[PDB]
């Protein structure tokens, strides 16, 4: 589920990562690793019983958002527009709301 919702984010952001110039090869690779790697953080938290793993998935999402701010506003030329950021932020916040509940459900079963 969370992975299904998150594939929407990958579907959106992946072509944008692809577009990024080779001039920014290293930032771009780190972005891609952050973006695809996030599935592994969800899967791992799924196949385990530690909240620390969901907390890690969470950091993963916050880091992906940083990447949007980087591509939008630090990288020259910029690789995203205010509205592309916004669209991505929306896709991500959905996943983050699911995650927030998941974490709450688990911390309730203390």
């Amino acid at each position: 589920l969370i992975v299904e919702r998150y594939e929407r984010v990958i579907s959106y952001l992946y072509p944008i990562a692809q577009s990024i110039p080779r001039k920014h090869g290293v930032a771009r690779e780190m972005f891609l690793k952050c973006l695809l790697g996030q599935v592994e953080l969800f899967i791992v938290a799924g196949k385990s019983n530690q909240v620390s793993k969901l907390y890690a998935a969470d950091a993963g999402l916050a880091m992906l958002r940083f990447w949007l701010r980087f591509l939008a506003g630090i990288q020259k030329p910029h690789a995203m527009t205010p509205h592309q950021v916004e669209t991505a932020q929306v896709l991500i916040a959905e996943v983050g709301r699911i995650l927030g509940s998941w974490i709450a459900r688990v911390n309730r079963k203390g």
Copy 2:
């Protein structure tokens, strides 16, 4: 530990297909290769341990490899649907063994 040998079968099928992925998706292709081959290590470490957590970590690795199939299929084209189906069989075969091994250390943890 026929599970490593069933898994070497997944490798034999998937590797030359991954190797043929175009450099246009160079980073996805490398992350995939790394996931594909580094999996063995999850299986090694699991068998030379006593903790179910390392069986789960192995399972996560398999679930991640299936994500890579969905991801690579829906690209543009990196895997023919026949290739996806086929690799799914091989992976499923490894997984049922892993399922039992897992449910076995949980029927033993009682």
Copy 3:
């Protein structure tokens, strides 16, 4: 995310310079870049968490970034950074380290 906003200032000053580092120092250039950017995750991890140990690791990160500056201003065949760029960056990093100071304070509570 205030400390991160401040740190983005360090990034926007240092990223184009890092990126401009001649390819002959390709390995170092990459490690630099990974340290500079990865550092945001050190703050986020600390942020999405309680433990001071995580705020300490974000402080080591900065300490490692400062090493990269000293190293890059020093190296040769070819050069990589000027002592003036290093000096400018430290001004940006020190502000981030002061905010990190206030934040470690508030937490060690």
Copy 4:
């Protein structure tokens, strides 16, 4: 570190072979090299430590080194003579690691 010195024989024999793998197998060639050379660290770390987990870790690394050989065979890129030789050298290392672990497990 009797084990590192023995392992160095493994590196000596295996590293040139690793090198001459065509760039076609770029990623696998590099992960292999990294396993081969990274193994020394696994040994060093277990030595500058008490935890047995560092030793099993080192054992895992040897298991994985064994997989790379099976892999470079079925790929042409490694003669079965080479596998034969290399497996012996690794067995030699694995021997020493075997003892070392047992001696740490006896209390």
Copy 5:
């Protein structure tokens, strides 16, 4: 933190040498560079943190670094014994400062 300054000499001596290793040994070159420069973080992280385990990691790091020299000495022809001899002495100077550092937190504890 005279330890980092003492290590920077090791870096000074060794970096140019690492750099002039041919691309023929490209993968080994980089692991060597990663261990070499990477070591600074090991020391830096040790300092911020009381755990002896971090000091052992650093020692393990220095140990790994000495391994690289033997490996590059005989890549068949890529580091002269003299060069190795000279690096040994500079690392040894770091070795002493760590050995003391490690051994004092074993008195303190």
